[PDB]
Design an enzyme around this catalytic site. Structure first.
Site, short mmCIF file in Angstrom:
data_model
loop_
_atom_site.label_atom_id
_atom_site.label_comp_id
_atom_site.label_asym_id
_atom_site.label_seq_id
_atom_site.Cartn_x
_atom_site.Cartn_y
_atom_site.Cartn_z
N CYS A 145 10.36 108.93 40.55
CA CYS A 145 10.32 108.52 39.61
C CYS A 145 11.06 106.55 39.57
CB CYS A 145 10.99 108.03 37.89
SG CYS A 145 13.02 108.02 38.02
N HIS A 166 15.46 106.85 34.81
CA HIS A 166 13.73 106.43 35.27
C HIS A 166 13.58 104.80 35.08
CE1 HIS A 166 8.96 107.31 35.27
NE2 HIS A 166 9.09 106.94 33.74
N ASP A 202 2.98 103.58 35.01
CA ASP A 202 4.20 104.99 35.21
C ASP A 202 3.68 105.76 36.12
OD1 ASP A 202 6.29 106.72 35.68
OD2 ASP A 202 6.83 107.07 33.46
#
Ligand SMILES: CC(C)(COP(=O)(O)OP(=O)(O)OC[C@H]1O[C@@H](n2cnc3c(N)ncnc32)[C@H](O)[C@@H]1OP(=O)(O)O)[C@@H](O)C(=O)NCCC(=O)NCCS
Length: 252
Positions: free
Chosen positions: A69, A108, A123
């Site tokens: 991520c 994250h 995202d």
């Protein structure tokens, strides 16, 4: 004209070079999910570099690799900045649904985009839980082949906002705040994921990617395929691994 990053970005994601507007974000997210594998192989191999625009372009675009991520979204951040969007990175903390607990603090990294007086979560790093569309802070549901998603401003032990998701019942995907984070923080996040005892990503290799009929995941031990509603897990051997990585994920 376009920057080197933009040129390489377009090439990797097989998207014709063009001006990118808000309405083009869906296409960007879709291709990323279908092409850029979510993986932690550098952590497994012990070949982790600090995060930077150049290093991201080199790894994820030029060497045709994937990432976690904080790498996927850091790259997209730079790309969107080059495209002229009002974006910034923020930390998030994912919730472990199986063991009912929060994963490590700030494990994250996501993007917050401001467009036409509205904020959206961008995202591309949530592995198989990819929204594939900007998710509005106004709360409307966003649906894709991976499921449904919505943003809610709710305070939690780990933040001020949350991204909830479901296929049937809504559940917290991750919590986050609107505090802007820089490259140093992003490098700190990487280190915590590399060394935290409860870090989910330093325990075994994982590589995941979306497909037209679902998504696929590969570990050192098993190959898991989600295909047209079905979900199979197949134990693999050393050689099946190298081959699947290559043939299914384009990682060589
Ligand atoms: C990775 C993911 C796609 C795997 O789920 P899946 O494809 O539906 O298939 P499964 O749930 O059966 O899991 C397959 C393998 O993933 C492994 N796995 C799941 N999450 C993992 C993680 N965070 N790190 C390493 N391995 C993981 C499981 O142990 C399993 O291994 P196995 O088959 O050898 O037993 C899913 O857990 C996911 O999307 N996770 C999101 C990760 C995240 O939070 N990313 C953002 C922060 S970096």
């Amino acid at each position: 004209m376009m920057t080197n990053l933009q040129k390489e970005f377009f090439k990797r994601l097989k998207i014709p070079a063009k001006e990118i507007t808000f309405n083009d974000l869906d296409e960007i997210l879709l291709n990323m999910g279908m092409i850029l594998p979510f993986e932690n192989l550098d952590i497994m191999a012990g070949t982790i570099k600090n995060i930077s625009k150049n290093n991201l372009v080199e790894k994820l675009l030029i060497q045709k690799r994937g990432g976690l991520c904080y790498e996927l979204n850091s790259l997209l951040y730079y790309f969107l900045m080059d495209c002229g969007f009002q974006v910034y990175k923020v930390a998030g903390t994912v919730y472990d649904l199986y063991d009912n607990k929060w994963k490590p603090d700030d494990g994250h990294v996501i993007i917050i985009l401001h467009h036409n007086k509205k904020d959206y979560v961008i995202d591309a790093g949530f592995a198989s839980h990819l929204p594939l569309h900007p998710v509005p802070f106004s709360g409307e549901v966003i649906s894709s082949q991976t499921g449904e998603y919505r943003i809610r401003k709710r305070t939690t032990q780990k933040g001020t906002h949350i991204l909830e998701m479901r296929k049937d019942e809504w559940k917290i995907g991750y919590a986050f705040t609107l505090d802007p984070i820089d490259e140093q923080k992003v490098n700190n996040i990487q280190k915590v994921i590399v060394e935290h005892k409860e870090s989910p990503f330093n325990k075994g290799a994982i590589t995941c990617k979306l497909t037209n009929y679902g998504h696929i995941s590969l570990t050192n031990k098993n190959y898991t395929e989600t295909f047209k509603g079905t979900k199979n897990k197949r134990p693999i051997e050393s050689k099946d691994y190298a081959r699947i990585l290559r043939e299914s994920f384009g990682i060589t």
